[PDB]
Design a protein around this nucleic acid. Structure first.
Ligand SMILES: [Mg+2]
Lengths: 687, 55
DNA sequence: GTGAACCTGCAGGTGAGGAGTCCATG
DNA sequence: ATGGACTCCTCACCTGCAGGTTCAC
DNA sequence: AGGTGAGGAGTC
């Protein structure tokens, strides 16, 4: 099989994939105790109740800091106890066997040293029962409950380890938001706890380290307030160059985690991350996208566009608003009371669930009858924003999608796409829309597209082609012809080659140590008040500088003896040529106030921009455009390409160069896989 | 008669909040947790409190 | 000689953001 | 009374102006 | 029945 033979790395983007874990086995074996509770070879068909009781009874007795579960086909479970400890269990259905701390896989042991010994890093053994569920939960936010209750809802960030199946079971970190709610909110007034909260693990807050931990006594359970909902914490934040706001993100807690493994273990255990090699990185500007979209709209100009309304209880000027939005782009449309045949149509419909089952849905009816016409639809609520103003973005999206279907219908491209590998056929599996299609292995139809001359040909793949593909796939046929999630494939008939693109799981991280050091220096600098004499000296020494006019103003409104604080310099920016010298001159004397952190020469914020491609390993990722902002809310992912090639063809690189699949952002999906996916949608109404 | 106009100062309040609860970590956390204002009502609060204490 | 493109990287974001009191009526 | 694994759900994005360089005629 | 991605809740 193929192994993840990466490189030791010297430079490049930083990854959440752990490179090496170092643990001193002597310091762990001589300081703790590991046992083994074997339930193998008893009965594999009577697992449920016996496993339940196994876990519960193993928790029942013994001073146990933590316990992890071993592999399903491996030795026992794994437990951690302090020195001179006992795992005495009365029942002998399972056998105990003391072992050492050098006989376990590294990640399992490191998980144990991450959970319970960092939570006890102040106090231990004060009571009978103690345990930590999983990970560490730091605190970032609290919210007050409605007036009828008491307490707060808490927001936490979780750090833990997990495997990565795509890269040979290599270890990855994780960071996730979890929410805690008080107990009384789920308990009825009659003392009857609701069914969900009757059996729930309880937790307790702390006032020193801001860590939520396990305890039998406590007024918190792990569940949100109302129902299925989401809470999230931003990735990074450098607003106004503050070091307090940088400490409350998902990369600020990660900096604290590395400072807590040092103050409890010293240098015995350390975690080192991996840098993916990279030499080809293409930043995308803003002008290129703009010029692309202009030519996008020009082609749509020379056609006919009709808007129709089919709501029952007609209300709102949705047609007028949409037409205004369209006409602001020099595209002229019209309003019709019934859809016209042979012209592009945008229809306004209602909620799909409302209409009865045998009711003849306007959309379905007016589709099935007119079978040579392109269609679009929208709900009337999406054209107005939160504050009532019209939403432009929706209008642009609708127009672009219309053009895509028109391109499919006419079988000839209208705008200049790049070129791709030739003599290849595109296959896409398609899940049945029947609700009975919960069968995992049930065969699916597969649709095929190809290019001959200048015309695309679309047809449903025959049985023979499907037999041909699976033979050459090999061990990779499971991703194409098996499972609840089936991925498309490009196939070469002459040589028997395939292309599959797989999401892996790594989130790209930017630099966070180098940013933190700078922010701390700025915080220390912005504490003192600058003396008046220094400013007078600067005025005398540089008569020609233009900044003087600003300075003289401030000094004229202030006391002649009291020192000047930082907030009086807000009117001068760090932008012009004569404005940089002033701040640098103050820096030489010990006053550091402003600096540059988002320059492209610095290279800190490069993991969230541009398009990145590595050919020999087949790794790529895409991010934003322009310049970094103060607030970023998502981490980019990492993808891998699986091939049977001796050397991957140089023509694949061109399929990721289209700027109208992610609406002004680079994409991570080939363009020929979009058109075909719009042909498997207008084929569910033909018959 | 002496007259003085007071602007907003954030570094003035930052240190004071830290001294009020010396065992915490940041300033926004102290303001949100021990005091009772959420993230929406933070800029306006900072604004008046700074001037009041400065006077 | 000049004025149109052309090319970085620093700021700033919906509105604005509360007490106190007189008199007649079934 | 317990742990870690698939499947379905909801939520956010889709900048902007100012100052220094440069051709293109 | 805007879209593509990145990601938090509820159970065998
Ligand atoms: Mg569609």
């Amino acid at each position: 099989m193929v192994t993840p033979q990466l490189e030791p790395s010297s430079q490049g983007p930083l990854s959440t994939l752990i490179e090496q874990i170092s643990i001193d086995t002597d310091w762990v074996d001589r300081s703790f105790a590991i046992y083994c509770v074997s339930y193998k070879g008893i009965d594999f068909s009577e697992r449920p109740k016996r496993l339940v009781t196994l876990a519960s009874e193993t928790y029942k007795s013994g001073s146990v800091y933590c316990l992890v579960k071993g592999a399903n086909k491996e030795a026992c479970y794994w437990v951690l106890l302090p020195k001179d400890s006992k795992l005495d269990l009365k029942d002998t259905s399972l056998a105990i066997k003391p072992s050492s701390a050098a006989e376990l896989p590294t990640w399992q042991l490191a998980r144990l040293l991450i959970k319970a010994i960092p939570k006890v890093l102040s106090g231990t053994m004060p009571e009978i029962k103690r345990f930590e569920s999983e990970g560490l939960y730091y605190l970032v936010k609290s919210k007050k409950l409605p007036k009828d209750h008491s307490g707060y809802e808490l927001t936490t960030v979780e750090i833990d380890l997990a495997p990565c199946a795509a890269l040979g079971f290599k270890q990855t970190l994780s960071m996730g938001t979890k929410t805690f709610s008080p107990l009384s909110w789920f308990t009825l007034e009659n003392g009857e706890v609701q069914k969900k909260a009757r059996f729930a693990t309880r937790y307790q807050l702390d006032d020193v380290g801001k860590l939520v931990s396990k305890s039998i006594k406590g007024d918190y359970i792990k569940k949100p307030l109302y129902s299925n909902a989401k809470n999230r914490i931003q990735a990074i934040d450098i607003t106004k160059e503050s070091y307090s706001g940088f400490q409350l993100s998902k990369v600020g807690i990660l900096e604290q985690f590395m400072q807590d493994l040092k103050q409890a273990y010293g240098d015995s255990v350390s975690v080192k991350l991996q840098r993916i090699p990279g030499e080809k990185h293409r930043f995308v500007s803003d002008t290129i996208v703009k010029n692309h979209y202009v030519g996008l709209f020009d082609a749509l100009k020379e056609h006919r566009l009709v808007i129709c309304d089919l709501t029952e209880n007609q209300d709102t000027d949705a047609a007028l608003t949409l037409l205004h939005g369209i006409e602001h782009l020099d595209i002229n449309a019209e309003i019709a009371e019934v859809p016209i045949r042979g012209a592009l149509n945008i229809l306004i419909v209602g909620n799909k669930d409302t209409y009865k089952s045998d009711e003849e849905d306007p959309y379905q009816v007016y589709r099935k009858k007119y079978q040579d016409t392109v269609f679009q639809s929208c709900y009337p609520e999406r054209l107005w924003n939160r504050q009532g103003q019209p939403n432009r973005h929706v209008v642009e999206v609708l127009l672009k999608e219309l053009l895509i279907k028109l391109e499919v219908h006419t079988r000839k491209h209208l705008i200049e796409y790049p070129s791709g590998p030739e003599r290849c056929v595109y296959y896409m599996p398609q899940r049945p829309k029947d609700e009975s299609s919960e069968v995992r292995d049930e065969p699916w139809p597969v649709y095929a597209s190809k290019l001959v001359g200048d015309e695309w040909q679309y047809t449903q793949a025959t049985q023979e082609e499907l037999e041909d593909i699976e033979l050459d796939l090999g061990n990779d046929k499971r991703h194409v012809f098996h499972g609840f999630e089936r991925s498309p494939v490009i196939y070469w008939p002459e040589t028997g080659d395939y292309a599959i693109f797989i999401d892996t799981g790594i989130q790209m991280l930017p630099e966070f140590e180098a940013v933190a050091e700078r922010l701390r220096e700025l915080k220390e600098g912005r504490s003192q008040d600058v003396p008046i004499a220094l400013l007078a000296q600067f005025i005398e020494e540089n008569p020609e500088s233009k900044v003087i006019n600003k300075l003289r103003a401030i000094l004229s409104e202030w006391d002649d003896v009291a020192p000047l604080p930082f907030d009086e310099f807000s009117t001068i920016a760090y932008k012009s040529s004569d404005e940089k010298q002033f701040y640098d001159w103050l820096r030489e004397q010990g006053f550091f106030l402003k600096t540059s952190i988002r320059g492209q020469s610095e290279g800190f914020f490069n993991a969230s921009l541009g398009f990145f491609y590595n050919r020999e390993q087949g790794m790529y990722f895409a991010g934003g455009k322009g310049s970094p902002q103060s607030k970023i809310e998502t981490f980019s992912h990492l993808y891998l390409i699986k091939h049977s090639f001796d050397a991957l063809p140089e023509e694949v690189e061109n399929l990721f160069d289209v700027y109208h699949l992610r609406h002004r952002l680079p994409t991570v999906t080939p363009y020929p896989f979009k058109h075909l996916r719009e042909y498997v949608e207008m084929q569910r109404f033909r018959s | 008669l002496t007259v003085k106009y007071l602007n907003s100062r954030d570094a003035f309040l930052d240190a004071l909040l830290e001294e009020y609860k010396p065992e915490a970590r940041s300033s926004h956390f102290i303001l949100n947790h021990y005091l009772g204002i959420a993230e929406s009502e933070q800029a306006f609060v900072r604004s008046w409190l700074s001037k009041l204490l400065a006077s």
